[PDB]
């Protein structure tokens, strides 16, 4: 029970699992989960298991400044904020006075799914996809709203040799697990390589503190304008003719956040809160190099966590490893019930949602999976330097408790027990679903994925912006299939999804996931 | 902390040269000067006059007497259970839990008693938390009264509060608080003051003479004649008769009338205050001899056996008790290794004996026979190479 | 006895009984409740039960700044300042210094309009859900403007602005503070939002307001002069929103950022407000507390009440029912089964209830398990947003009756009511409510409760206004909350007629008529 690092936790409780109850550390006797307690493990060469300012007893016991999320309660997942900026409107004016103004919508994870390449059938134990480019939440991509495709140059009489101005509306949000005080975004604007003008904001004019979850401006409120800014008061961003005629094509404008600074909260003996001597400036550059990154994108909200893991090649560090399933169980509020992880009600699983990987970590995890005999990627060792994106289906049925398809699927029978996850379907005849434009976002990209087994040829038929029908012969075990398509505008016809089997096949865990947006 | 530091440099600009030199002398030698201030009064007058620490001790005591507080202050400090006659460890440093049964033992040990606090002691003004030193599981949180000594002083990067505790304490309550997951005992006690003189013997003589100059006129001639007998040699015969179980084994009605006259004379003028006196007791007063191996306190086991036998007990003297206001060592009983410290409640019988002219008694006071003392504490020190004991006891009626 | 935190009150006295009298702490024994003394409940794990910069001792012992409301002396309600903007008069002039062409209208600012602007009622309410769901929940930050002195006339008629220029805008504004907290160093910011376009943002600075904004009071002290927007310059406008404003839409007032400090009693004398700020404790407060808004027909209050998390053993935080949370949040007299303000009775059947999507869904989830089927006995979870609307007119065939007209066929000689008495319906019931008590061009909902102890004994109701209707109400053995919409119009119209034809057996109770929002007039 000797203490090596000064944190007042016995070392036997840190090698084993321990929980904090009665504001003290007791060993995990594997009978406190039904109470509602959870288990932590702390490293002993350093009193801070993760590199956050808060210490292992304070972090693992809930002694922090209360404003952070509840998912940073473990001493393994740190709490630092990841701000983000988006645009919700565009104004183009020539006065230093014609004006054209439209609406824009932002997606946090759109460039991360921009370069991912899909394959029909995954011919390994990988059963996933690898993207070429990994983008965080802090950068984001925008789409202008409906305008019937009319040219932007017919509303402004601007020729070669003249410059228009940017006016817009912006919103600040957080997706991490921390509020950051004295908000100084210092964001930037890029337009396919060349930047137009960086955006510099001050502490008091925008919101001083910016808590996670909620936004500045709040949900369902007017976004903050660029005219009401001391820098952009007598001048705005100028544009030449070539740039606007390039934006006449199917192109988009993107935002990033470059560098921020500010203080953090702490406690006091005489007072209670002071945020002057604190800073995040010298703590981010430790967290960014020790841990591994997870990003999730539900269709309404994105989350990210940063979970620590050991390097394989060095005996000298005693930071305990994790597997991928336990890492997403601890990082997220993932309840593991019947062996399956659920965030709130959306299932999260290798067999239920889409997982997207970068290029470097894919090689290492494919090397590790050959050692693994389970051939499932939730049990491989999480190491330092992992970057994983996970995307939720808009619609995903598993012929089970989770069903969200907006139209009923024709010829579906779930009277079987040999499905991969609970019951499955039988393609005795053929399954079909009509899904119109009003239930879908316009001018997008999608992939349709699922698990099949055949203990025969199966034809898929997708009515889309381009009709696509295809064949696939299934295996006796489960092989994941996926098919890419794109849709067209709202006033068009529908999406008809048709699957004709051979009578003796089983299909389970069928999903539709958003990938990209088609240009115009 | 901020307030403490603020009147630390507010005090520091009014200090003198010898006072500040004694202040850094204590800054470098805190523990030894504190233990010296605990037990210096049981030495000789010339031992104190030739002691090296006495000039710094009196300069610091002058500084503490100069700095008085305007309001009662709740203060905090850490100290061993052995200080409060709990001669054992409540919880160790590797232990974090003070159980309910050992808290009950501490309750049933420290209750309903007055415990001495003497010498210089550091304390803290606000409740210690995580960033402070917590050496012991025992934190006392005391209401210091008005005008008590108060020295906030900045030592290097820290600040500390030094006082001259010169009072007993009554422990009103103890509660079981938790700091950094470790159980601590937080003691809410009361400062209870008694009149003590120690080495200040001339002023105590003046007080006893002022309180007892007309006492001889108020006694009967039988009482006055028996008092004159007692101060002229009758103390030997009277005390010998009383220890020998006089009225039972060998009844002497003349000596019964004599001791009744002395008892009524002591009942004539009860004392107007709570007092603290000292007595150079022999081993024969404690069931021991000079040849007793237990009398040699130079080994620790004799000290511990004496503490086990005598602390927390009621001791009865069936004879009249002759003590004095002085705590100093004398040539008459420097041989004796027992120094008894007695706290007398107000209104108890007794008189100051050295107000009568023609008596060779040195600042002596007398107590009625059959008296009982509740022994509260036993401490130890080194008079020369001889280990001597300090027995803090209180007169119970 | 045993102490945990940096307070004198022991953890045994910190839960299940909590009383402070004459600067000492005592438990509760249900005897001295009439001595001006109340049992509180606080935490024993920390000094500050809420995010306030005050301990549970001082606010429940009076050792704090006296400008705070006495409802905030309870430790379970967070002291929280809210600074809002009311607007009263619009003037439009074409000059850039202040002659020119001027038009002038007098407006009313409504706080609780856009929260319930997209609220529609059902004829029958399912399960025990006697409430509605809003499209969006709004706090009292936004104000919606209703022009009352608006004759049939385009704003272009008074301006005759042709192609490219326009006039300038000026307005009369007021600054209210409604909360359990004051604020001293006034520096607010407020946007003039026009349906997605930011017209301008006004900052009042410090000298135009003064160094005090106490709760419940405005900077114009009740009746004082409206503050025009010239003291800091004029605001322009363009000729593109003029017809847009003329047709259907209104200008919204949105407070954005309000800076200020608070006062703390020092050791010696009066408060100090230099080492303080209402900019650090705010996010600490908002993270734990729920939101209870109440809107009387003349005023509003809103309260931050600390609630709990069910999905953890570790936390020890007080739990409340909804009705008791309202009771301690605003201060309510406990009548026998009833809650009272100074005059308004409040219940789950005497006021109107608004939740957003998440709160309504989780309350419907909780309604499956409660054995009493009421809103007010639902466990209080951190992060609820609940709006209460005190009805404009409400009667119960009992002691309260505030209706201007008198009905027909009123039989109150019965006691099988929802609350005490009921009404025996025999035939028609006629109320001919004069229009002068009804605001122009407003949406009003009539709600009632029906109990018919017969198999198919039904009634008709019939609301006669400019947008009239005849509805067929089928009551059952229990009561239904039945609600019908209608719209008031401009003042040159007649009374509102409400007829209902009963069948001699049906019973009604708790009849109320309330306002939702304003309908857009054609201009
Ligand atoms: Ca450790
Ligand atoms: Ca450790
Ligand atoms: Ca399934
Ligand atoms: Ca306490
Ligand atoms: Ca508490
Ligand atoms: Ca009634």
Residue numbers in the entry:
A (entry chain B): 218 to 313, 320 to 678, 682 to 746
B (entry chain Z): 67 to 463
C (entry chain A): 218 to 315, 319 to 451, 457 to 748
From the paper:
CDT is a member of the Iota family of protein toxins which also consists of two homologous toxins produced by Clostridium perfringens (the Iota toxin) and Clostridium spiroforme (C. spiroforme Transferase, CST). All three Iota toxin family members are assembled from two polypeptide chains termed the “A” subunit (CDTa, Ia, and CSTa) and “B”, subunit (CDTb, Ib, and CSTb). All three B subunits are presumed to contain five domains that are involved in regulation (D1), oligomerization (D2 and D3), and host recognition (D3’ and D4). Once proteolyzed, the mature form of CDTb forms a large heptameric, soluble structure referred to as the prepore which binds one molecule of CDTa to generate the toxic moiety, CDT.
Despite a significant number of particles observed in this complex, the three-dimensional reconstruction was limited to modest resolution (4.57 Å) due to issues arising from preferred orientation. Nonetheless, we have successfully assembled a pseudoatomic model of this interaction. The interface formed between CDTa and the CDTb dimer is facilitated by interactions with both chains of CDTb (buried surface areas of ~241 Å2 and ~122 Å2 were observed for Chains A and B, respectively). Moreover, our data indicate that assembly intermediates can form interactions with CDTa, suggesting the enzymatic component spontaneously associates with the intermediates that form during assembly.
